[PDB]
Structure 1
Amino acid sequence: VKKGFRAAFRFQKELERQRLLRCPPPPVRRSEKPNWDYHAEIQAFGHRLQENFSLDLLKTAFVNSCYIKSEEAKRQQLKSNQELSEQGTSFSQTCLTQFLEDEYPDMPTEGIKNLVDFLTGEEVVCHVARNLAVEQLTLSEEFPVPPAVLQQTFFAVIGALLQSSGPERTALFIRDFLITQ
């Protein structure tokens, strides 16, 4: 028994690290960990992308309809997402067909439809919105945020930027995140 405390503390934490690598816990969503202020971080998501939102409208862009239903399942013991996502995916489909009809005039429109259904696919939009902190702000039922839900929240964020600041700034947004894919 070697007297002292610091080697036992360091060894105690390395044992904690091998406990975390041998049997890691299932990943918890970020709003259920320390250092979360939801409102401050929606505002940070606004200023991060270099645009302004009406913050309540972006807040409803992150609130799904599954979350309200399981939330009211939890009440017994909020505007949904679908309007903004409808407007956002209608707009982004027609503006992606604008860009891809302008810069590729010789394409068949079957090919423009398959390009646009790539740039609004679940693989692309789910790969984009996991690196723009959309997934951390999504109020969803289950974690990880399932890909149809997160596609819906991403186009809800496009709809909220549309009602915020018009069609030109969303056209620059869609240009800078969906077309660069």
Structure 2
Amino acid sequence: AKKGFRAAYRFQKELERWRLLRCPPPPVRRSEKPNWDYHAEIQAFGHRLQETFSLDLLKTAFVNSCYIKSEEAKRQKLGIDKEAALLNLKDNQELSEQGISFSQTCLTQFFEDAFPDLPTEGVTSLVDFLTSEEVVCHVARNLAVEQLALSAEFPVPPPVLRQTFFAVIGALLQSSGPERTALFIRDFLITQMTGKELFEMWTITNPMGLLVEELKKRKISAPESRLTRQSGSTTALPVYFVGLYCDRKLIAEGPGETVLVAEEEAARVALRKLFGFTENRRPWDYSKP
């Protein structure tokens, strides 16, 4: 009856692995886990992005209305006296507003200066895409902004995480001049646009009409659809190439399964050249003046 402690004890680990596999654990705040120092985290956060924050402003930035409302719920239901020092908490509202306004201003200036030929609606949509719930949620998640945020409901729903993220931006705008925040935004946001196409984030469903409009605005007369190469018309798998001609010159050309889809594609290409978003365009500048 002299057993392996090594055996039973080692098997305990397996038993635990199986428990964790059949019932997945609900995600828990890193703040509730064994190793946490919130001040150290805050200081480190700024140190690793090479930014100078008054720690006061950054602490202000991660505070959410939800955390305060829950804190007040607990202060009321336990009979604990909190109110004054808890109202001194100063939520991230102001900072978040400063943040979004300056952020959209900043991006809009970037695209305006980079791609002169984009229409108002274009820079509008691009900015709208970099500031989109999804993208900001993603970037915020990977910078450990979700971990350092104080709010109720630990999965930290997207509309919260966004506020939280821009709060950091506004907080940078206070501590550092617009010149520094420029570099930060262009580093952790504009980069999300790498690899993605124009009409991927435009969603405009009328390529033809918009092409005609832009050509009218350019004093260019008559876009003309003409069929260049086609392989198989009788096959379940035909292939077409429509060129678009403005006064005998070929402005763009595209592939498709039908004549319609091909027309759409040539339209996309033309639009891309005119507006200036193309595979050949210079990669985005990075230099630090």
Q: Same fold (TM over 0.5)?
A: yes
The CA deviation string for residues 62-109 of structure 1, in whole angstroms up to 9 with x for no partner, is 001111111111111111110000000000000000111111110011
Q: Which runs of 5+ in 2 are unaligned?
A: 79-88, 193-289
| SS at structure 1 position matched to 2:31 | helix
Q: Distance in 2 between matches of 1:168 and 1:74?
A: 43
Aligned residue type for 2:115: Y
TM-score if structure 2 supplies the norm length?
Answer: 0.62
Q: Does 1:141 align with 2:141?
A: no
Helix, strand or coil: the match of 2:148? coil
> What CA distance in whole angstroms lies between the structure 2 residues aligned with 1:179 and 1:82?
24
Partner of 2:90: 79
Q: Which of 134, 137, 145 pairs up with 1:126?
A: 137
For 1:88, give the aligned amino acid. Answer: G
Match of 1:51 in 2: 51
Q: Which AA in structure 1 matches 2:175?
A: S
3-state SS of paired residue (1:79): coil
Which of the residues 75, 93, 100 maps onto 1:89? 100
Aligned to 2:111: 100
- In the TM superposition, residue 17 of structure 1 has moved relative to its aligned partner by 0.8
- Structure 1 gaps of 5+ residues are none
Structure with larger Rg: 2
The code of the aligned residue for 2:173 comes to: L
Q: In the alignment, is residue 32 of structure 1 matched against residue 43 of structure 2? A: no
TM superposition shift of 1:34: 1.0
Give the Cα–Cα distance (whole angstroms) in 2 for the partners of residues 63 and 87 of structure 1: 16
Measure how far apart 1:129 and its partner are. Answer: 0.2
Question: Which secondary structure does the structure 2 equivalent of 1:130 belong to?
Answer: helix
Question: Which one of 78, 87, 110 corresponds to residue 121 of structure 2?
Answer: 110
Please state whether the residue corresponding to 1:32 is helix, strand or coil. coil
SS in 2 for 1:26: coil
Work out the CA distance in 2 between the residues paired with 1:72 and 1:39.
23
User: 1-side partners of 2:159 and 2:46: how far apart?
Assistant: 23
Residue 58 of structure 1 deviates from its aligned partner by 0.4
Residue 127 of structure 1: SS of its match in structure 2? helix
Instruction: Give the deviation of 1:23 after TM superposition.
Output: 0.7
Q: Which has the higher strand share?
A: 2
**C-alpha separation in 2, matches of 1:2 and 1:69:** 58
Q: What RMSD over aligned residues (CA atoms) do the two structures have, in Å?
A: 0.9
The Cα of 1:2 is off from its aligned counterpart by 6.4
Moved over 3 A (4+): none
Q: Distance in 2 between matches of 1:177 and 1:115?
A: 15
Q: CA deviation at 1:127?
A: 0.4
Q: Tell me how far 1:21 sits from its aligned partner.
A: 1.0
Alignment of 1:156-171 (within 5 A): 156-171=167-182
% identical equivalent positions: 90
